[PDB]
Swiss-Prot record, chain A:
Observed effect of gene inactivation: Embryonically lethal. Embryos die at about 10 dpc, due to defects in heart tube development. Cardiac myotubes display enlarged rough endoplasmic reticulum and cytoplasmic vesicles that contain high levels of Ca(2+).
Native source organism of the sequence: Mus musculus (Mouse)
Expressing tissues: Highly expressed in heart, lung, cerebellum and brain. Detected at lower levels in adrenal gland, stomach, thymus, esophagus and ovary.
Subunit structure of this chain's protein: Homotetramer. Can also form heterotetramers with RYR1 and RYR3. Interacts with CALM and S100A1; these interactions regulate channel activity. Identified in a complex composed of RYR2, FKBP1B, PKA catalytic subunit, PRKAR2A, AKAP6, and the protein phosphatases PP2A and PP1. Interacts directly with FKBP1B, PKA, PP1 and PP2A. Interacts with FKBP1A and FKBP1B; these interactions may stabilize the channel in its closed state and prevent Ca(2+) leaks. Interacts with SELENON. Identified in a complex, composed of FSD2, CMYA5 and RYR2.
Protein modification: Channel activity is modulated by phosphorylation. Phosphorylation is increased in failing heart, leading to calcium leaks and increased cytoplasmic Ca(2+) levels.
Taxonomic lineage from the root: Eukaryota, Metazoa, Chordata, Craniata, Vertebrata
Protein's name in the database: Ryanodine receptor 2
Curated annotation (Swiss-Prot), chain D:
Tissue specificity of this protein: Detected in heart muscle (at protein level). Isoform 1 and isoform 2 are ubiquitous with highest levels in brain and thymus.
PANTHER family: PEPTIDYL-PROLYL CIS-TRANS ISOMERASE, PEPTIDYL-PROLYL CIS-TRANS ISOMERASE FKBP1B
Source organism of this protein record: Homo sapiens
Ranges where the PPIase FKBP-type domain occurs: 19-107
Protein's UniProt name: Peptidyl-prolyl cis-trans isomerase FKBP1B
Catalytic activity line of the entry: [protein]-peptidylproline (omega=180) = [protein]-peptidylproline (omega=0)
Keyword terms of this UniProt record: Cytoplasm, Isomerase, Rotamase, Sarcoplasmic reticulum
Listed EC numbers: 5.2.1.8
GO CC, alphabetical: calcium channel complex; cytoplasm; membrane; sarcoplasmic reticulum membrane; Z disc
Amino acid sequence: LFLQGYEKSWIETEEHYFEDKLIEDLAKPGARVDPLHQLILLFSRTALTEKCKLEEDFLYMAYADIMAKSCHSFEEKEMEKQKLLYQQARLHDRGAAEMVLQTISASKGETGPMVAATLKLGIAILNGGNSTVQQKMLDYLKEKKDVGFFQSLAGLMQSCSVLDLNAFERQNKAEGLGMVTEEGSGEKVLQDDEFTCDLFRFLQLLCEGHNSDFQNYLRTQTGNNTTVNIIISTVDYLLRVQESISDFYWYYSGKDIIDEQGQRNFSKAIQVAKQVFNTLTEYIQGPCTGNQQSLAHSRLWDAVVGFLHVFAHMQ
Amino acid sequence: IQRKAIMHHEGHMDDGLNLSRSQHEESRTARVIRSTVFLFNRFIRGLDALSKKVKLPTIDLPIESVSLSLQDLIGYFHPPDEHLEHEDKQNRLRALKNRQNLFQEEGMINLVLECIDRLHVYSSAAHFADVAGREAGESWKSILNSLYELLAALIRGNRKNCAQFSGSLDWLISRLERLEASSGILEVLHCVLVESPEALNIIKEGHIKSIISLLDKHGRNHKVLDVLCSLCVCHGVAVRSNQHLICDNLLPGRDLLLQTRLVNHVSSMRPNIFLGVSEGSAQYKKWYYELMVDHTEPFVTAEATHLRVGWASTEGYSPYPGGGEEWGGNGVGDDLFSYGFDGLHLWSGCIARTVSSPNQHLLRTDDVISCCLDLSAPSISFRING
Amino acid sequence: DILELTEQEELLQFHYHTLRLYSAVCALGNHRVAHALCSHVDEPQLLYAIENKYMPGLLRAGYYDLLIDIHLSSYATARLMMNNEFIVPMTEETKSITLFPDENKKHGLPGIGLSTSLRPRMRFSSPSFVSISNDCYQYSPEFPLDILKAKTIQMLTEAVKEGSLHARDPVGGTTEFLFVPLIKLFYTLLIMGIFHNEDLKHILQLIEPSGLLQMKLPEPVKLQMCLLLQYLCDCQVRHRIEAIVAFSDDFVAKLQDNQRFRYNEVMQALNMSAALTARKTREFRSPPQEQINMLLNFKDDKSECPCPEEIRDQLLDFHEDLMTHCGIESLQQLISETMVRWAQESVIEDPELVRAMFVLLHRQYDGIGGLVRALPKTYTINGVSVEDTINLLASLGQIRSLLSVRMGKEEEKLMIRGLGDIMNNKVFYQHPNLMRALGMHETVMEVMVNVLGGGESKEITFPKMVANCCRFLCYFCRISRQNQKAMFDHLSYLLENSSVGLASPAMRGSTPLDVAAASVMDNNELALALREPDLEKVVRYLAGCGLQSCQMLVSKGYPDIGWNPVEGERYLDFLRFAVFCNGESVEENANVVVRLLIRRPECFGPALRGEGGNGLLAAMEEAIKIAEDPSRDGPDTIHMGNAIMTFYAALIDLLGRCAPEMHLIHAGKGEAIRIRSILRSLIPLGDLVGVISIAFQMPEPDMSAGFCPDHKAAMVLFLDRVYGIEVQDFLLHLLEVGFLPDLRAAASLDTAALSX
Amino acid sequence: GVEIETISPGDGRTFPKKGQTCVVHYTGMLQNGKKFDSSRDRNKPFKFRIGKQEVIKGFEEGAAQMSLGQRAKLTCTPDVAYGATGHPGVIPPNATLIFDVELLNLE
């Protein structure tokens, strides 16, 4: 029991920082192709090999986190903003911008620790308004007319997470019956909320700034044959999470007590809905009449009236 | 679950017909499927109307047409070259996989099986010529080879098609002794064995014995050995039944395969003496000499130490007598041009014969042997310890 | 001559493929064939071939592979399978590596020191064919290892000396033919437990001096160098874990007595107040897990750490020593140098090479990842129980080796034997966490899935092999609390193929459905966590069973009833286990079960539910008549009447245990009242009273495969839970009609008591 | 059926009796000279008890007629060695055997 407690709460307590020195010395061509470039090419070929299910690939899951954690009073705010661009260019010119797209496309809509690890890499590589990386990704998607990326995004969005009241009250009854240990993944009521937030932050960074090209390519993939609408999928997920929030509030009616779980599981969904709203705001931020009309002729009005109804009483 | 489509006035207000176009790959695959099935049914009818009985030869036998169609269809499944870009290679792999799937889901593998069945009822090009004509007789072999190549290409990579048609292995291994298509049948069986582990579940002792008899009949083929290797393990997993069958039916007799052994390096020593008898000048035709030993060892490393002595002939009237060519395990008595003795047996032409002697024993230390030689009427003789 | 094949290409290729076949027929742990192959080639011809310089290359590689396969492969694989499981005893020799030399400016050498770790023993039988009736030849043919290791060292030195000068005639043709088989043999020899400390020092000095890593080596050579370095890191990880255990021994020795001493002090100096209970609840409550979790926490400035502050500093010293022993600020140095140096030198094809290189580099850079991965899989038991756990590990290794082979008759027999041995072993009970850390349940499940594959409804072959695994898993889940949670994860899969093993009273125990029930049995936490992705599946299975009878039964010759009362009864038993727990019905499970049952009304018996049969009275009477009349059965056979009676009794017992409660929540709740009303409308009361009042006979014994007295207990439970006893005339009439006759039949006993 | 042809005499004094263990050094071989077994390759002599039914009859009945230090060629019969089934993998059915047996020690 001592060694179990030791390995549980003594060793993995963030006792190292190498994610920058490693990648720094992994790009020096001391003498062709750099070692980091060879690694990116290996990952890209593995993601391009035709299969039926994205394997675990512990090597990829281990290195896509180091490459992600490698990235990140006027001069003190400009020097870091330029060093971030330098750290992003340290690996986005070696093929990571296309490697992330291929890894997302090779999962065809399966929520796993591979997409959950490549979305964080995409976040780290598109931190801020990196119009250069955005244009590289757009040019890649337009020159290789693949649908398996947009349909994979749709399949991922269709099964992200929703606050379910039955499992929440079931866990509450279990806690009342006995002191059962708390489930790690949001008490098993909100599944991979961090994954959902990362996916929607990625979709936001893909259109950050005022990139009208990508704003229109997310609505109509001109050049393909089975285009899918990402704006409508985002609206559908927002409506789902709105109905979930409304039901979770209707559960907490009459009782003027909000416990720790009732606060945490609610704040998680609040953050998820805020991220979805920011993503829609970035979709329609530039005066793009396409996305304007797409949001007009959709089910966003039901979501916003439900949000108004829940706000007027929660306030 | 099938719901028939009836055209009527009222109908149901839930149809919702959505169009969906197919790619050029799928459309061309369907059209070539129709074309090849039409041509193959024509060929099957033309061959059956001739093989069923003696009928008037107003039949359509598209010999050259079906040959060209097979030559095109074989290249239609050509795997991508290894000297190609990775993405283009993966695209070609996916394309040929979809092609193989669409060709299998129409059951034309069974069609080419029926074709080779109806073609195997003959024995040779001469047998087919006087029945179907000279051109068909001389092209029967090429048509069979092309059909087997196409059958192999249809199963080269798919895991589904091999496990689907594995039930036909009872016929392939039976026809494996055709002697004019054994290479094609062996390639097909190898490609179906290295892919699906389900096909190995139906391989019985009869099939393994047939393969070993093929290896014994057609000589030393290095592909039968690959087939036997693929029969032991398929995908990281072994089958003890087939392993035991191979070990018990292939190498108990040692006739096959090539055996091996570790022998010793033997040498010979001879003085500058030559004895030639004929008419005229003779040398009394009588000779004698002794031999003793100081130290000996029966087994120095692993085997009995070679130790023989005798008289060796020559070829004509020159040196270099014939025998074990050189630098081998052949001493005296291992050829028809030498006669030796080693204490127990008399050696002549690598064949030993035991002889009686008072206290017959191997040539241990401090042993004196005496070799006598008369030429004309008697022969070489040995006396051990007198 | 062997060397003459150099010119003859046909015989060379044929003999190469012959050697490949020799290795393939004995590739895995099959020794009956290897004992034959040894004589088929030779004992010393292999040594001559591996030592000879003028070999054709292909033949050299083939002979090397064959030598590895016939003897070394089996024990090498058996020792590599147990390479990530660090079981270490508490012997006084184990309490000697607590220094793990790292201070005074030194770091030690990899693989040098002391192990004191449980590893599978090696033993080889002597190949003899004049001895009749060999005992088992279970392990391997004997081979002299000292001569082999000496020759390997000599040839490796000669090979590195040859490669340093870069000649144009490497042994066996090119340089890969010279290097790959030699380093492969050296690698498997290093794996199998030879090259003791002194020899390992020379083997290190072969590459380390700051050699072999600095040369211009081909891709297949560096690919084996990667595995060599991976083992050189694994042995260091094992040494670190052993040192951790050695220090933890003394730490726990100094901690447990100090905790007991402070407890005795605070119990002697009582000073009873309102805070002493809060201080001393930790001793009785707070099981040792969270006890040690809360008594071992000092990374911030201060926590509620008890009075033993002296041991805190020694733990800090040991932690800093571990940190400096790891890469956190000399093997990591040169490994990280070479890994990047190769990639900088040239672009590398053969993606497996670059994959191994990068996983090695990442391992060296993380350092603590190996520790956080391996420490859960470590374990310590005692210095006394060693032979028992060694036999257990050997049996588990045999289980895994049999898993790696396709299922056959002899394979099934060996697996059954090994399962029996691990069940009979004592460590199975004393250390239940050890089995979970070793993954015995996952191994048995991945063996069972191989047998359960092949088909779904056309073959259930190897039934004993199916059953033994189920019974082992049942025992494993039974003796624990956490193993039930472990098997609950796999519960989802086996409910898909739970239809096997039913319709046959040969396995009333071992069954996938029964192992599911055992996993979900008697735990409210798991009963709640049993959500609804599978209850609808079980209900659909029940409906299909109540709609279709068993084709196996109609083949055996049963009268082809319009439904099946066996698999339905099994599904009802599983649903009962899911809904009823510890005497209190799980409310959510009960509600969803009633909802699914009413949504799919075919699950109920056709005699009870439907526009045909009336209900339970006529159903039970007809079942009794069918049991009495042998014309409606199999001409030990399945009594169809008894099976129908058991099905209906199981359904009624399920509904009764699924009733809301004893009116604790039902008194003030609405949905509970609604569920009770649904049950009452589904099952009439008079039908229940009539079924209770049958007054079975009391028998020279008789056969109990008919109207069993337990059938009445289900009706009694349903009456008590759904309706209850609160009316005087109702209670009296029930006692008159359904209780007095059975009471008289029970009281009329003198000696002939065949039914308890 | 087993016959013995001596190669080197072993002073013919000590013979194997019931209740003893004998140490031999043998290089078996098939009828056509193809060696199928040997005890000198592994460099370990073969120790076996006399009369315990652990080796083949063609070997034990032949060794029971030899002396210490006596080399012999023992020619066996298929029925007394392996029968009509032989040894699966090595010995074919209905095969005769030849053993070059030397007696090192007699305990």
